[PDB]
Amino acid sequence: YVVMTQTPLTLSVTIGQPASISCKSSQSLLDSDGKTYLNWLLQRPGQSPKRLIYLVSKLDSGVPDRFTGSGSGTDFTLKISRIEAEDLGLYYCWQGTHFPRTFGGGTKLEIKRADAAPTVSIFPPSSEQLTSGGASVVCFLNNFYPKDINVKWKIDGSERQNGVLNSWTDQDSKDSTYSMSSTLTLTKDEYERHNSYTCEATHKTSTSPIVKSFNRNE
Amino acid sequence: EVKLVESGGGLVKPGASLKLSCAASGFTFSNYGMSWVRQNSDKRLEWVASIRSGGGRTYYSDNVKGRFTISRENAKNTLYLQMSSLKSEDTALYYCVRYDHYSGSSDYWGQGTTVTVSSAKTTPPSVYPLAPSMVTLGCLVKGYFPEPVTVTWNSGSLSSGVHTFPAVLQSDLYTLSSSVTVPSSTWPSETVTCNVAHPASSTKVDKKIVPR
Amino acid sequence: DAEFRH
């Protein structure tokens, strides 16, 4: 098993600026036939993997020449002379020299855009759900950047940390923002013992947490 | 247009069998070696099996050897993966992949077919309303298995301002939410309904969002 | 890919 190691794991790049990714293999990828079977692949969000580079430096014919590849032996580099919006995704190196075929762990490239505050919405459990014995309080945090965000739940003032499930979207191709949902699920009886439910978002775009609340009374 | 279209993926019990297919078009299929590569939840890619264009020679990863069989039917331009003794560690998106002997690497990949190995049972979703210049509404789709579900708003006529979040797996059951944002002057004066479908359980639910 | 070249 030839180990393929990529650095960095994540890359945040501005449109128009250069970027590069390093791939290192645990042993030489030079084949006995004298060729070096080192390949690069891009998987866009929700899309099929697409070949970028093969044989170290050969450019796939569907790929623009702002992509180049170099290296030899155990050390290889993918370079992008100028980033474009559609470059968002997972980049993988992989080797075809040794059996079995092995892949690097991937590098996530995301597009750097202007900071944007989340639009926060909070929703009480529906009456329908309460009849099941459960109660989910849902908080949407939509269209923010950067993706680094912290959501905290408070019930009657006290911080609550579980029954909480969070889900993040990948970067939106339309506006380069992220969205996430945080859902706090309690038993019906637990939910009805308290009045105030609060969703608190900490993000670099405000000097204080962005807060949405409701009272079970109203 | 070289195209590879995998099918056959779905929920399968631990220890059971499942056969994947990959229909190839836009090239002379019999001339090419083919492989299966799988991608797990961590987005890690792992080669599975390969079959040559000639002589029917086959190759397997140490993880699937003795359990999987790769084969081809050139008369149907189709690649197969017969899986047996399946286990949780086999859960993945499975891709059909062409090796291009002219350029010296695998080139084209399909869209993938999803295999879920689990003893948990197919379970229909519960669909709950999420009600409070623009107003954001939503639907909570809870307790279903396996993936996927689809969620539209007003049968698709409401497309802008919609977010559907990736499902999260909580106790062998999936949950997701979808949000939709409309002008406040259109709700609740006009109706807003989320349409949820769960093909695996032959379920279709329409939940109108009514003010609290 | 090596398997296709042996």
Resolution in A: 2.0
The method recorded for this entry reads X-ray
Tell me the chain B residues in contact with residue A60 when contact means C-beta distances shorter than 8 Å.
107
Cα–Cα dist A78/A70, whole Å = 7
Tokens standing for B117? 């190995």
Q: From start to end of chain A, where are the E strands?
A: 4-7, 10-14, 19-25, 38-43, 49-54, 58-59, 67-72, 75-80, 89-95, 102-103, 107-112, 119-123, 134-144, 150-155, 158-160, 164-168, 178-187, 196-202, 210-215
Per-domain residue ranges for chain B? 1-119, 120-211
List phi, psi (to 5°) of A190: -65, -50
Tokens standing for A119? 């639009």
The CATH H-level (homologous superfamily) assignment of domain B120-211 is Immunoglobulins (2.60.40.10)
Are the Cβ atoms of C2 and A101 closer than 8 angstroms? yes
Instruction: Provide CATH code, domain A114-218.
Output: 2.60.40.10
Asked whether the CA dihedral A186, A192, A193, A196 is positive or negative, the reply is positive
Same-fold call for B1-119 versus B120-211: yes
Instruction: Provide CATH code, domain A1-113.
Output: 2.60.40.10
Tell me the chain B residues in contact with residue C2 when contact means C-beta distances shorter than 8 Å.
none
CATH architecture of B1-119: Sandwich (2.60)
Cα–Cα dist B179/B131, whole Å = 10
Asked whether the CA dihedral B57, B63, B67, B71 is positive or negative, the reply is negative
Tokens standing for A44? 């866009």
Could you tell me if A194 and A155 are in contact, meaning their C-beta atoms sit under 8 angstroms apart? yes
Instruction: Find the CB nearest B136 among A55, A121, A183.
Output: A121
Give the CA-trace dihedral at B12, B14, B16, B22, to 10 degrees.
50
- Is C6 annotated to bind a ligand? Reply is yes
Question: Residue A209 in 3-state DSSP?
Answer: coil
- Of the residues B95, B103, B130, the best mutation for testing chain A's interface (the one with the most A CB atoms within 10 Å of its CB) is B130
Could you tell me if B57 and B125 are in contact, meaning their C-beta atoms sit under 8 angstroms apart? no
Number of alpha carbons in the 13 Å side-chain half-sphere of residue B36: 34
> DSSP letters along B163-200, please?
EEPPPEEETTEEEEEEEEEEETTTTTTS--EEEEEEGG
Subunits next to A (3 or more Cβ pairs <8 Å) are: B, C
Q: In which residue ranges of chain A is CATH 2.60.40.10 found?
A: 1-113, 114-218
Cα–Cα dist B12/B10, whole Å = 6
Are the Cβ atoms of C4 and B105 closer than 8 angstroms? no
Could you tell me if A109 and A87 are in contact, meaning their C-beta atoms sit under 8 angstroms apart? yes
Ranges of H-type helices in chain A:
127-130, 188-192
DSSP-derived secondary structure letter, A216: T
Q: Give A103→chain B minimum CA distance, Å.
A: 6
Could you tell me if B155 and B182 are in contact, meaning their C-beta atoms sit under 8 angstroms apart? no
Subunits next to C (3 or more Cβ pairs <8 Å) are: A, B
